[PDB]
RNA sequence: CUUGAGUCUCGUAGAGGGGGGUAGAAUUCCAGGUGUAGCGGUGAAAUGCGUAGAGAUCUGGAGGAAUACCGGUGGCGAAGGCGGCCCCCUGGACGAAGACUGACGCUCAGGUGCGAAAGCGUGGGGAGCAAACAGGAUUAGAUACCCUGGUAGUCCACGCCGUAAACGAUGUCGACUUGGAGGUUGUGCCCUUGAGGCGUGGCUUCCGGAGCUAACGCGUUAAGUCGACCGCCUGGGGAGUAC
């Protein structure tokens, strides 16, 4: 649901340069946009059920990305987890 | 910002205010950033069944592309207004601009 | 393949036996290589190749005697689950010496009687016959 | 390429009182199924038919 | 490192979900006339309506339920399950090339969440129906069956329940192994007519080979051949019962 013009922004100030669509800083700011604003959805509806699996399925994929920062590499882990708020 | 295709149609007894109705709604639409792709009148066609108590109806269809929310008192209005019972609004799916 | 990729080897060779194929391929390891090594060396087939740089395949090629399939069996035996490791002077013999066990020395990769020669055990990786 | 408001290729996609052709008898693709169906009774609700 | 997994770019199909209004068919009474000997039903009456105007007609209302055709050998969803039209929000899937990451994976006891129907609780709603209950006759006696009314319920909001033959009675994930007949949805080449002819994917229905199976059967959507992890079984009854 999020616009292609919101990923190229966050693709280019995450991402190592313009079109780095697949790191792991670049998945995990998306994954974040996109919480936000579904929680934004389901604020207002509590009873959709449907997609707020599609949550979870997004919550959980980024709680393993950021694990496998965290085991990989620790510095440019720990600049997300604030350079995003993250871990709060 | 994407297609629509409003389909109204206005009672020969509501026949009486057409053009009144018809420009506020445009320049409504207008000064909300929105612009009409095309226009056209169907006339008064006939009506398979006698809906609210009539046989006739003047279809008009004004099809503006808009925004998410520009749409959402036009349909307010429509419902507060006995100009037209039932005004339709549609989508496109893709990027239609000419009539038939 | 996605866990037991000698497993998968394995398993294709019995496949394609048993489906009358005449060459069977599938990505390519160094220890995929080390097997097929030892059964191309014992005459449980005919050769092997592989091919490619950064993506090799390992292009087997099945055996028979006439319309039969010169591996009966071919079975798995350590896999990740049971790592199955003997003592040269426990090291099995497959079908009273008819066919191989392939062992893992320390010494790299041979068959049982090879090992039980030069004194060593090491991990079992298969039973062929 | 089909949609509701060319009511010449409905007629011949519904009966009098105004029942959808199944596509058993017509030959229809079955997409193009979907879509007629919904022309049809989007005009319907439109009132060009009951 | 790039083959698994993912991110990206672009499109497709869909009863996927939550909302918001939306319209008719049918539905009963009233609002009136039109009409007077009927309305009603079973094993049979009868019970209940009606001559106080009863049904039906058209007329408007009221209000709730549910969306006949399409409709399917269809589809989507983890499952439960999802079907009028239209908008808003939203989820997932798939296909084509390309880019990016760089094993980021699989499975999961415990845990967490969803979960038909009935039911419960709290407020409403109540057009039809319908356990209970209320008339008649039962039948060997009738608290048979039945028909006549009929309340909870059914519907909505919130909370609880947490169960089903919740079933493909078939855990999840990956790989490999002959065919034939379809359906649905993409897409490439060439007919640059719409299909087309030839591919190529995803889903899906049915035959059947080897194999497997006690047999029935399954059979590339495996119940074959394997690998990872989980759940489970251990004679029938007692009993999914007692504590």
């Known amino acids: 649901s999020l616009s292609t013009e919101a990923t190229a922004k966050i693709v280019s100030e995450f991402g190592r340069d313009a079109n780095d669509t697949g790191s792991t800083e670049v998945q995990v700011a998306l994954l974040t946009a996109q919480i936000n604003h579904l929680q934004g959805h389901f604020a207002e509806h509590k009873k959709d059920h449907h997609s707020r699996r599609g949550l ?6 980024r709680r393993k990305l950021l694990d496998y920062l965290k085991r990989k590499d620790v510095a440019r882990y720990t600049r997300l987890i604030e350079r995003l708020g993250l871990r709060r | 910002m994407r297609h629509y295709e409003i389909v109204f149609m206005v009672h020969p007894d509501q026949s009486e205010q057409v053009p009144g109705m018809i420009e506020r ?5 207008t000064g909300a950033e929105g612009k009409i792709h095309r226009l056209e009148d169907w006339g008064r066609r006939q009506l398979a069944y006698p809906i609210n108590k009539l046989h006739k109806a003047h279809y008009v269809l004004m099809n503006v592309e808009a925004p998410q929310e520009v749409i959402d008192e036009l349909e307010t209005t429509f419902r507060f207004n006995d100009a037209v019972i039932r005004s339709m609004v549609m989508r496109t799916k893709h990027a239609v601009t000419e009539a038939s | 393949s996605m866990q037991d990729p000698i497993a998968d080897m394995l398993t294709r060779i019995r496949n394609g036996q048993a489906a009358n194929k005449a060459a069977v391929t599938m990505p390519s390891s160094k220890l995929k290589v080390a097997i097929a090594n030892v059964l191309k060396e014992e005459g449980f087939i005919e050769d092997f ?3 490619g740089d950064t993506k090799p395949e390992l292009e087997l090629t099945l055996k028979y005697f006439q319309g039969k399939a010169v591996v009966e069996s071919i079975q798995r035996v350590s896999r990740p689950g049971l790592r199955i490791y003997k003592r040269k002077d426990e090291l099995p013999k497959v079908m009273a010496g008819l066919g191989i066990a392939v ?6 990769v041979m068959t049982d009687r090879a090992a039980r020669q030069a004194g060593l055990g090491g991990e079992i990786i298969c039973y062929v016959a | 390429e089909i949609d509701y408001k060319d009511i010449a290729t409905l007629k011949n996609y519904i009966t009098e009182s105004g029942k959808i052709v199944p596509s058993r008898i017509t030959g229809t693709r079955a997409k193009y199924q979907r879509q007629l169906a919904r022309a049809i009774k989007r005009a319907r609700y439109l009132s060009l038919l009951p």
């Not at chain 1, 979870?56 to 994929?61: A, D």
């Open chain 3, 103 to 108: 062992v893992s020395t320390s010494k790299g």
């Open chain 3, 49 to 51: 190749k592989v091919e």
């Open chain 1, 56 to 61: 979870l399925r997004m919550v959980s994929q």
């Open chain 2, 25 to 29: 709604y445009t320049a409504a639409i």
